[PDB]
Amino acid sequence: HPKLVSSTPAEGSEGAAPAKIELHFSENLVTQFSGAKLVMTAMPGMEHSPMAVKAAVSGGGDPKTMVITPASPLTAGTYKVDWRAVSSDTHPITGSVTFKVK
Protein backbone atom coordinates (compact mmCIF):
# COMPACT_ATOMS: atom_id res chain seq x y z
CA HIS A 1 0.00 0.00 0.00
CA PRO A 2 2.23 2.80 -1.28
CA LYS A 3 1.60 6.29 0.05
CA LEU A 4 1.78 9.66 -1.67
CA VAL A 5 4.73 11.33 0.11
CA SER A 6 4.62 14.65 -1.73
CA SER A 7 3.83 16.34 -5.01
CA THR A 8 4.56 19.38 -7.14
CA PRO A 9 2.21 21.27 -7.34
CA ALA A 10 1.64 20.50 -3.71
CA GLU A 11 -1.80 19.70 -2.35
CA GLY A 12 -3.71 22.97 -1.87
CA SER A 13 -1.08 25.04 -3.62
CA GLU A 14 -2.29 28.04 -5.59
CA GLY A 15 0.18 29.48 -8.07
CA ALA A 16 1.60 29.29 -11.60
CA ALA A 17 0.45 26.88 -14.26
CA PRO A 18 2.65 23.74 -14.09
CA ALA A 19 4.40 22.36 -17.17
CA LYS A 20 4.32 18.91 -15.53
CA ILE A 21 2.88 17.51 -12.30
CA GLU A 22 5.06 15.24 -10.22
CA LEU A 23 3.67 12.75 -7.69
CA HIS A 24 6.20 11.18 -5.32
CA PHE A 25 5.36 7.88 -3.57
CA SER A 26 6.84 5.84 -0.74
CA GLU A 27 7.58 2.81 -2.98
CA ASN A 28 8.83 2.16 -6.51
CA LEU A 29 5.95 2.18 -8.95
CA VAL A 30 5.22 -0.47 -11.55
CA THR A 31 4.61 1.67 -14.61
CA GLN A 32 2.20 -0.55 -16.51
CA PHE A 33 -0.38 -0.31 -13.72
CA SER A 34 0.11 3.16 -12.30
CA GLY A 35 -1.93 5.92 -13.90
CA ALA A 36 -3.53 9.34 -13.42
CA LYS A 37 -6.34 11.48 -14.85
CA LEU A 38 -6.30 15.28 -14.75
CA VAL A 39 -9.59 17.10 -14.37
CA MET A 40 -10.59 20.71 -13.92
CA THR A 41 -13.17 21.20 -11.19
CA ALA A 42 -13.56 25.01 -11.29
CA MET A 43 -12.80 28.14 -13.21
CA PRO A 44 -12.24 31.35 -11.22
CA GLY A 45 -15.68 32.36 -9.91
CA MET A 46 -17.48 29.13 -10.80
CA GLU A 47 -17.26 25.46 -9.84
CA HIS A 48 -18.16 22.96 -12.51
CA SER A 49 -18.52 19.23 -13.06
CA PRO A 50 -15.03 17.75 -13.47
CA MET A 51 -13.80 18.23 -17.04
CA ALA A 52 -11.05 15.91 -18.16
CA VAL A 53 -7.99 17.67 -19.52
CA LYS A 54 -5.78 15.84 -22.01
CA ALA A 55 -2.54 14.69 -20.36
CA ALA A 56 0.10 11.99 -20.66
CA VAL A 57 1.34 10.01 -17.70
CA SER A 58 4.78 8.41 -17.36
CA GLY A 59 7.61 7.69 -14.95
CA GLY A 60 10.06 10.40 -13.85
CA GLY A 61 13.79 10.27 -13.06
CA ASP A 62 13.18 8.24 -9.90
CA PRO A 63 11.07 4.98 -9.87
CA LYS A 64 8.97 6.48 -7.03
CA THR A 65 7.77 9.36 -9.21
CA MET A 66 4.80 9.55 -11.60
CA VAL A 67 4.75 12.48 -14.04
CA ILE A 68 1.57 13.98 -15.55
CA THR A 69 2.21 16.23 -18.55
CA PRO A 70 -0.76 18.32 -19.61
CA ALA A 71 -0.99 18.47 -23.43
CA SER A 72 -1.60 22.20 -23.32
CA PRO A 73 -1.22 25.08 -20.86
CA LEU A 74 -3.54 24.95 -17.87
CA THR A 75 -5.72 28.06 -17.50
CA ALA A 76 -6.60 29.60 -14.18
CA GLY A 77 -8.86 27.46 -11.98
CA THR A 78 -8.90 24.39 -9.80
CA TYR A 79 -7.58 20.99 -10.88
CA LYS A 80 -7.46 17.51 -9.43
CA VAL A 81 -5.13 14.66 -10.33
CA ASP A 82 -6.86 11.35 -9.66
CA TRP A 83 -4.01 8.83 -9.33
CA ARG A 84 -3.60 5.03 -9.15
CA ALA A 85 -0.24 3.77 -7.73
CA VAL A 86 0.85 0.12 -7.80
CA SER A 87 4.10 -1.19 -6.39
CA SER A 88 5.59 -4.67 -6.40
CA ASP A 89 3.02 -5.67 -3.73
CA THR A 90 0.24 -5.50 -6.36
CA HIS A 91 -2.28 -3.50 -4.30
CA PRO A 92 -3.93 -0.71 -6.32
CA ILE A 93 -3.97 2.51 -4.27
CA THR A 94 -5.94 5.56 -5.41
CA GLY A 95 -6.17 9.13 -4.23
CA SER A 96 -6.41 12.69 -5.54
CA VAL A 97 -4.23 15.80 -5.45
CA THR A 98 -5.97 19.17 -5.72
CA PHE A 99 -4.29 22.40 -6.68
CA LYS A 100 -5.10 25.79 -8.16
CA VAL A 101 -3.65 27.80 -11.02
CA LYS A 102 -3.34 31.57 -10.48
3-state helix, strand, coil in the chain (%, to 5): 0, 55, 45
Distance CA 28, CA 39 (A): 25
How far apart CA 20 and CA 17 sit, in angstroms, is 9
Contacts with Cu ion in 21-50 (CB under 5 A)? Answer: 40, 43
Residue with Cβ nearer a second copy (3 or 48):
48
The single residue among 47, 89, 92, 94 that binds Cu ion, judged by CB under 5 A, is 89
User: Which residues contact Cu ion by CB under 5 A?
Assistant: 1, 40, 43, 75, 77, 89, 91
Annotated binding residues for Cu(+), written as ranges, equal: 40, 43, 46, 48, 51
